[PDB]
């Protein structure tokens, strides 16, 4: 369960003595742990990528708790994400507000800042992740 060491909260499994790791459901809340410490970021759960957010981002969530986050972009540590109606980060080719993006399969982060090979073809992405016109 939850213990406080120095000042931060850690979670341990009832079968171990070292902190939990990976995606976990705890009393209707979602977390992604690293050596017991909830991680902030966009990580893969059982139904896609969730936003495990800084505390008090939505509905008084705690640090690392997954949140509702609908129909909007997120900038996180310089990486660009887009979240759909179901609060999951989109992947692959997407058209958003008339612009095309490609969200990478391993991370859900937008391809950005030049040429990428995707599906065997070379494409160009602006610094903002927007696919540029024409053939590359």
């Amino acid at each position: 369960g939850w213990v406080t060491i120095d000042g931060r909260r850690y979670y341990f499994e009832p079968n171990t003595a070292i902190g939990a790791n990976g995606y976990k459901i705890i009393d209707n809340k979602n977390f992604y742990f690293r050596n017991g410490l909830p991680q902030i970021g966009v990580f893969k759960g059982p139904n896609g990528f969730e936003y495990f957010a800084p505390a008090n981002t939505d509905a008084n969530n705690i640090d690392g708790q997954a949140i509702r986050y609908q129909n909007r972009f997120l900038h996180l540590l310089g990486n660009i994400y887009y979240f759909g109606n179901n609060s999951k980060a989109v992947t692959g080719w997407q058209t958003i507000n008339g612009n095309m993006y490609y969200f990478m399969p391993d991370t859900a982060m937008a391809a950005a800042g030049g040429l990428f090979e995707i599906d065997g073809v070379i494409y160009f992405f602006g610094v903002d992740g927007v696919k540029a016109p024409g053939i590359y």
Partner: nanobody, 123 residues
Framework: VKLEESGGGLVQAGGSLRLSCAAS????????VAWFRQAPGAEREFVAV????????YYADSVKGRFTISRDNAKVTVYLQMNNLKREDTAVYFC?????????????????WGQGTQVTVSS
């Protein structure tokens, strides 16, 4: 993933030269491969890149129409065919593999490099 370059030397302006970049392993064929060129004391500037599939290419505006990048799956080799060569093309040429398929114009994104070979165009 070891890369061996060949084909370097000297040509007159307007002439042609073909460079080869041969890999030691079949995994090479799964990744995009680029050529960069470098003048003495200068930085490695982008020339051309080819997709893993061999059918998608991008050229520096400077060389579009004159240079062709291609690959031979059976030989695990990428080529740079240089036509209508100009003195401006004189440089050391490198081939390189970008296994992450990310930001293909940027040499810092490339994780394996050939040894580099001198091309000289005399006018």
């Amino acid at each position: 993933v070891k890369l061996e370059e060949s084909g370097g030397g000297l040509v007159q302006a307007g002439g042609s030269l073909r460079l080869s970049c041969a890999a030691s392993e079949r995994t090479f064929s799964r990744y995009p491969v680029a050529w960069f060129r470098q003048a003495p004391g200068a930085e490695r500037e982008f020339v051309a890149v080819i997709s893993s599939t061999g059918t998608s290419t991008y050229y520096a505006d400077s060389v579009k129409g004159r240079f062709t990048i291609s690959r031979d799956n059976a030989k695990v080799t990428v080529y740079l065919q240089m036509n209508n060569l100009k003195r401006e093309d004189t440089a050391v040429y490198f081939c390189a593999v970008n296994s992450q398929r990310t930001r293909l114009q940027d040499p810092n994104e490339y994780d394996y490099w050939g040894q580099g070979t001198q091309v000289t165009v005399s006018s």
